[PDB]
Amino acid sequence: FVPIEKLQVNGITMADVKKLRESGLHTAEAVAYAPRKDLLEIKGISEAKADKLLNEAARLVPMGFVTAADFHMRRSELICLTTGSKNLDTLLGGGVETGSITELFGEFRTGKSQLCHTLAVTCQIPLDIGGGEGKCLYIDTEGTFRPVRLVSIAQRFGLDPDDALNNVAYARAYNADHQLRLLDAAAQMMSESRFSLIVVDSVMALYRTDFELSARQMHLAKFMRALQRLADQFGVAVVVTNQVGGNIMAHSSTTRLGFKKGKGCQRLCKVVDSPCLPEAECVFAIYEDGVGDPREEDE
Amino acid sequence: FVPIEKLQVNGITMADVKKLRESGLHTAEAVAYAPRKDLLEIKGISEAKADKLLNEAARLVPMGFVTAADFHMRRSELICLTTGSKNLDTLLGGGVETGSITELFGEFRTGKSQLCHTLAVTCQIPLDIGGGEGKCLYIDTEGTFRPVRLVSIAQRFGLDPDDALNNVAYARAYNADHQLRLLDAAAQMMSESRFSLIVVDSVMALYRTDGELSARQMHLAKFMRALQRLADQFGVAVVVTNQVGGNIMAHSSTTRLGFKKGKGCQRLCKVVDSPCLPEAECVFAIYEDGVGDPREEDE
Amino acid sequence: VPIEKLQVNGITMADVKKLRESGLHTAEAVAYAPRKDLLEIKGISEAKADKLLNEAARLVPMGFVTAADFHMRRSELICLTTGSKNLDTLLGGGVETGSITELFGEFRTGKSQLCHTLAVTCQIPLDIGGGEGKCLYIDTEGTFRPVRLVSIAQRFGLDPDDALNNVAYARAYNADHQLRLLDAAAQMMSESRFSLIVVDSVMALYRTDFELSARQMHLAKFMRALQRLADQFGVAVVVTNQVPIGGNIMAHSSTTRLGFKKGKGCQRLCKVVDSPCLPEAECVFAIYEDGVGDPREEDE
Amino acid sequence: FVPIEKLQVNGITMADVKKLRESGLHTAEAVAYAPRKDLLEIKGISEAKADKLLNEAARLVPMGFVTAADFHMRRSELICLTTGSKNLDTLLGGGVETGSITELFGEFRTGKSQLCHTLAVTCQIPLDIGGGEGKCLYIDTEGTFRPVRLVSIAQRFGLDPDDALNNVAYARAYNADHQLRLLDAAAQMMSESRFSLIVVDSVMALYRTDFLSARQMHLAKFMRALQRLADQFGVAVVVTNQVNIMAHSSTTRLGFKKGKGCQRLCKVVDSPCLPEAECVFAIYEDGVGDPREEDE
Amino acid sequence: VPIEKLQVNGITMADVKKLRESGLHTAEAVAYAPRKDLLEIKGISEAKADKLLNEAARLVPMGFVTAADFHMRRSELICLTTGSKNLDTLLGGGVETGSITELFGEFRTGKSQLCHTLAVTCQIPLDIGGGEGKCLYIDTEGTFRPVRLVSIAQRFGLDPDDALNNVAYARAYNADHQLRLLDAAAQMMSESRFSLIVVDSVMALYRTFLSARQMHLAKFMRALQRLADQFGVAVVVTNQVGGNIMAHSSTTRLGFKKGKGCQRLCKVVDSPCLPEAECVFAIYEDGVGDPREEDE
Amino acid sequence: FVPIEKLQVNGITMADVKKLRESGLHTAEAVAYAPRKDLLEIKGISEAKADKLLNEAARLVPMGFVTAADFHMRRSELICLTTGSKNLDTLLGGGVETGSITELFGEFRTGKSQLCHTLAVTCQIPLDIGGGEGKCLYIDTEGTFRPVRLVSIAQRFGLDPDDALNNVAYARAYNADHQLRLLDAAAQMMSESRFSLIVVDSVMALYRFELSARQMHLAKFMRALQRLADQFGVAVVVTNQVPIGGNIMAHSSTTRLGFKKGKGCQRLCKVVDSPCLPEAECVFAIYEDGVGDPREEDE
Ligand SMILES: Nc1ncnc2c1ncn2[C@@H]1O[C@H](COP(=O)(O)OP(=O)(O)O)[C@@H](O)[C@H]1O
Ligand SMILES: Nc1ncnc2c1ncn2[C@@H]1O[C@H](COP(=O)(O)OP(=O)(O)O)[C@@H](O)[C@H]1O
Ligand SMILES: Nc1ncnc2c1ncn2[C@@H]1O[C@H](COP(=O)(O)OP(=O)(O)O)[C@@H](O)[C@H]1O
Ligand SMILES: Nc1ncnc2c1ncn2[C@@H]1O[C@H](COP(=O)(O)OP(=O)(O)O)[C@@H](O)[C@H]1O
Ligand SMILES: [Mg+2]
Ligand SMILES: [Mg+2]
Ligand SMILES: [Mg+2]
Ligand SMILES: [Mg+2]
């Protein structure tokens, strides 16, 4: 991404920069994608200078037309992260794709939290072996997150236990308003540092008891679009878990994966929906050290 | 169509042509269709020479009266793009007509994006099979375009895997203002070469996520009107996808096709609104290489 | 009455050509026009304008007319046939030749289908309700398809070739072009018999081009021109409207108004919202591939 | 009225009477009310002849003020025209009165055309039931006139349909000049046959498109001509309008408002003697009348 | 922390009393409460409620934190030993305080014995697996036998009078009484330090409820979760062999099987982090402990 | 215990008390332990009336928390019924605890009927020697009622045989509804007179139903038995054949005693379920005078 401090030019005061940052925008992409009406609504900003900064960002941030072959090259360039099972990578065609809010849904005790822990660890590892080189962002709504599993999985991957311990931002929410307030600080801290993943587990746990359906349904809509807005500005893959959101999950999520409890430690994962993948299923396994491919003993 | 650089006659200099270039009228047809008052509102153009260039444009572009024979022959000579499915081809009366807006709508995962991707390759094929011998353009709003689908489909008609990917302009919109802003750039770009298709997917996805209830319709009308002008200016097929506006989208779109999810790869299509087509219904199957007729194995 | 007929006791052809370029192509057009309009035209003197005015007035009756004579004259007016017996009975013969008829309602009500049906029928002989005159179609939304015309002609049995040969189309890209189309079309209404003008739609261009007052008197000018054409040539005029928006400018001009309501599938309800003569009522009609008609019992 | 034939006394030449008829003077009242200056303006009329005719006509009818004791009682026996509804008759205190000017203003679809049709059909019934015992004169300026209507209304009132249609004179104007010109033939018909009601519907419609000071002066000339015709021929005058000179010239003014269904609210606004009150009247296929109990 | 720190920024004592009437005994519940719940309280304005929430957030930590601090916080969490070191090793110190531990299995295996045993351990010092707090035992079948409590206290060396004078028994005859017992007990856990809640059982009353049972059970279970959150107290419940509805909120689940004589087998069936394994313990008159050579 | 008559305060009509008596609630303790619904379907009782009854019961009877010391001292003061044999009383901690569910299951013709008759006789002797000083109600279902044995045990303990016979109300059970009516009448005159022991021999004689419906109705019979025990603190003893019922009856049975037929008239009794008393065994004997300690001649 591009920092917002590289955007001010032609006698635009830093005070305007603070005013924009206090409103939630923290990068050039955020300003460029932001509608001009919202920028005008911010107090203490002239509309003429608002349009000046908007067109300066448009000159800086590229959003013009481009040939499809170039788009193919850029999409091949996109960072992709190994899940931890070669079968999963083959099914995903390389692994989890950033810039896309992937959803993993299914019945509980199928390894969703274990897979999320493995995802955080594989986002801690360097990009050379396919890692993300960035910090995760884990939002828990049930108290299930346990650092011991992270330590074990990191030791499987060989990373420093303390680096993995201190490079994950964990925050447990207690109500829907707490989640929404938490997202703002999440974005603010996202601004300064380099991250590579935002995992939420689970969105509906608090919403199930906080509610009155009409207020609940609209409250997710502004919540989820915040994750979508944050994903494109910073280019971080977004993973959402769920229990068995209706149409909101389907509309918001790009690639969906259903989970099923297989025999023993083996588990089934199915590509229910995808923009460029066929509906195919495969099998992985979960051990005390994380997530891997099923072994001959597991057969 | 009629290139703009051939209407210059009877004492109009290139300065007026450049002024029209900033005015947006990039074709003799465009200036002929534009109302006189808009020409008067253009700074630096006197009303006398405005009416002059208007009458040379009207001489060069026929605004007069045509019989049903002439317009019927022109209808016969209109270019239609093959849908890749004989059932769908017959449902559409032979393809997608020029200078008319098609609105595919329905619930998600019904294959609208697959239909758009399939159409994106039929334009470049030789016209004898039912193409248009041109180069496509893809304006996206949800980030679901995929060159890999074009790679897979180009082999159905034998097209080159890279000549298909270097002859498709691409761009993405992020906010409501950018969606309308892209159209002037599209018109400027398309004035140099024969485009044959435009895609907008989807229309109101940004408008729902953008008191505000009244203000969105007026913005929607301004954007949707611009597409209708674009089709008449250049004679190209524009395809807009919709999710489930109301009257604004119902009135503007020339043709409307509703999609429904069937069993497996089977999907149902119904002509919801057309001026000269019966309200029929057909079935089509999405395969690895695009949209096609259902197979006996899947039936 | 032909314009070339007005040549009496020394009408110079230069004055005739001046009238031609002034837009007046019918004897009624000069008979009804005020003298100030003639004086506003260059090359026209006041005394000669007055004498040509009286020469025009002595042909067409321009005085008191007893109500009985007006009633018998109006009862002889050719009523266009819409093919649907229900709607034809609703309006006492259908659309009348020489008055402004407006159709309005929500979307998906088949007004365009009715316009198409009237366009096809107005070419059939008088016995089957046609006007025996070529049709004119000013379109502002590109909703004309000359493929269905052949099918409708087959339903009405008249030959397809001459039925297609006997229509004129004009696409309208702007309100100024829409107004100029009437001036353009006046001469060919003065060249061969005409019985039907269709405009679709009225409000579409003014909705986008507009500022309220400017739109208001521009629409007033357009409606005045339409009424002038209807009076001069005696040709039926049908216009399409979508929903009212604009207030009363279209309500005062529109002699007849119909409102369309969605029914069940092919069923639609027509209600005479405004009419100086016929009482407010309602009726039902259906649309099929052959055109507008009365719904069948199976469709009920 | 008094025909101009008896005006000639002591060998007054018939040529002068013919010239007066060609000048719009068809009755002795017109000559009496005409000043000397317009008589001088007429070609072939001398000053001596002008003053002689003024003396002959003035000695027949007075012009100045009168004693109110006879004035109010003589105003009672004036011809009244019922509107077919008791609400309006009570509101007007006798209904429409001839020899005056009454305006009906309001929005469209308020029955103004319908009430004008009712007046035009009710002007022939005998005076015992609020009739007029005369023929109407309808001037139309929008094409709204639909004869058929009348037949049904006359059958409601029991008059013969053929007589109802044949005894109503109808004119249509295409321009303001044509509208003004029709008044010459109107005056000629007034001279030829007895009429007792005039309707204009609508007076202002053409002036919207035909035209500003020229428009105002033309309206003033039109209204003064109508007032004059009412003066000589004792014909009630009713005008229609859509929503200062017209109000000033008008004596009685009634505003119309749309009620519920067939019901509409009629209100008296300006009147020399009548108070300010409203009423409700219904309009049906048969015409204008009092609301039925079913609509209540 | 006590809600007494809330008396800042000019908010009156009356609001604190109203909150105490609604069970808002400690500041943790005030902070975790949603807006609507505190809005429902009578005599409370939303304007001051915004502040109330602000200082509630300031007093108790609510923002982001790195996982190192979370791990070191949960590592030093108080754990209550069961007297069976085999269990301790299996549970990594014993039962956690502030979470939900569920027991299921055959009644012949014996779980009420463990419920009795844990009652005294909450008072012994922390260095030997104690809690140093009060215990609140709720029974639904009247199995409370203080003689076993005296025996286990003598095994632990504590005074039986101290054991009987420190724990609080409560019995419920219905689901509503069970629900309101928690509300009543909130005052006692507010006024004094408690370190253990034992429920035996949770499905007994619900057996003698079908759809409304799930909502009632969810409310009761989330109330038990709230009590652990608002005071850091351990919560342990028993369940005879709910289902999935209990399973969602079940942080830890232990299944029991009957072995040879007094020997019993305990399996940690479900746990967020702990592996799936089994162990063996024994039951004697002194309580539940590690198996001895006599049972081997 | 608190009589139901004294419960009605503050406008509670006596007809409501009569309706409660007819329904089955004969004491204020029953209303105190009565739930919301059970009071709701009682005739003549409304929601406000039920709330008033519950409030009055809470005022009269302590409904809240009870400390361990108070519960222990109340249990200590509870009257225990002697068995007439030193060994059984020693194994039972002084005898049978009143107001508790005790099940005696064993082989037929092992003196279970004799033991029940002995307990019925000993529940009327003075408290100084472990008696009850109250009436007795013996419910027999197997036709084992023997007045001769009752007279013999009365002579053994010095009780007057006629005073022993008239102090015991004998009830024979034919059907499940019949025994429910019998226990309803039992509570009916318990509301007006004091008793000391309830004997049911045998429970499973009439149940052996429909297998599932047998459990809930038996549980309701167990539930009804517990209600009266808490209302009056009277010992209840039920005999079981050879245990039938399984989990439900095991949970209902607060204490269980298995019986075996030893040599001669001697019999063996062993505890099965006891939260406090450890499991052990004992031996007793049966003679014409009833059930007592074994003698040296049979030992
Ligand atoms: N320490 C561990 N070592 C190995 N496997 C474990 C461990 N803890 C849990 N599991 C496995 O993980 C599963 C729990 O899945 P989980 O990630 O909790 O799904 P959810 O979060 O949806 O409940 C259990 O079925 C169990 O078999
Ligand atoms: N390579 C493929 N082969 C066959 N079917 C596919 C392939 N890729 C996607 N599909 C199917 O086509 C559908 C595409 O739906 P889509 O056009 O994305 O709907 P929307 O545009 O409304 O989101 C998906 O449901 C998917 O199951
Ligand atoms: N050839 C045909 N056969 C049968 N039905 C048709 C045919 N053409 C159009 N229709 C149906 O009739 C309707 C016509 O409505 P339309 O004329 O578009 O109303 P409007 O012009 O007022 O928008 C359309 O909804 C269409 O589904
Ligand atoms: N044949 C008829 N039967 C019943 N009612 C009619 C008939 N003809 C006209 N009307 C009614 O008369 C009214 C005409 O109003 P109109 O007099 O034109 O008002 P305005 O003169 O103010 O425009 C219409 O509202 C209509 O309902
Ligand atoms: Mg989970
Ligand atoms: Mg799509
Ligand atoms: Mg249409
Ligand atoms: Mg009218």
Author numbering:
A (entry chain D): 80 to 290, 295 to 327, 346 to 400
B (entry chain C): 80 to 289, 294 to 327, 346 to 400
C (entry chain B): 81 to 290, 295 to 327, 344 to 400
D (entry chain A): 80 to 290, 296 to 327, 348 to 400
E (entry chain E): 81 to 288, 290, 296 to 327, 346 to 400
F (entry chain F): 80 to 287, 290, 295 to 327, 344 to 400
Give sentences copied directly from the paper behind this entry.
To solve the cryo-EM structures of S. cerevisiae Rad51 and Dmc1 in the ADP-bound states, we mixed the purified proteins with 96-nucleotide ssDNA oligonucleotide in the presence of 2 mM ADP. Under these conditions, Rad51 yielded filaments with a resolution of 3.37 Å. In the Rad51 ADP-bound structure, the helical pitch increased to 132 Å, corresponding to an overall increase in the contour length of 33.3%, there were 6.5 monomers per turn and each protomer was rotated 51.6° relative to its neighbors, and the filament had a maximum width of 95.2 Å. The extended helical pitches observed for the ADP-bound states of Rad51 and Dmc1 coincided with the disordered ssDNA density, consistent with a weakening of the protein–DNA contacts, as has been previously reported for human RAD51 (45, 46), strongly suggesting that this structural change is a conserved property of the eukaryotic members of the Rad51/RecA family. Previous studies have shown, mutation of H352 within S. cerevisiae Rad51 to alanine, tyrosine, phenylalanine, lysine, or methionine, severely compromises both ATP hydrolysis activity and nucleoprotein filament assembly at physiological pH. Consistent with this model, we find that Rad51 H352 and Dmc1 H289 move away from the neighboring protomers when the nucleoprotein filaments are in the ADP-bound states, corresponding to a shift of 4.8 Å in the case of Rad51 and 5.3 Å for Dmc1 measured from the epsilon carbon if the histidine side chains. Comparison of the ATP-bound and ADP-bound states reveals that S. cerevisiae Rad51 D374 and Dmc1 D311 move away from the neighboring protomer in the ADP-bound states, corresponding to a distance (measured from the alpha carbon) of 2.7 Å in the case of Rad51 and 3.7 Å for Dmc1. In the case of Rad51, residues R308, R312, and D315 interact in trans with residues T288, D289, and R251 of the adjacent protomer in the ATP-bound state. In addition, residue K216 from one protomer contacts residue E295 in the L1 DNA-binding loop of the adjacent protomer. All of these contacts are disrupted in the ADP-bound state. The stacked aromatic residues of Rad51 are maintained upon transition to the ADP-bound state, while Dmc1 S48 maintains the interaction with R248 and therefore S48 is relieved from L189 in the ADP-bound state.
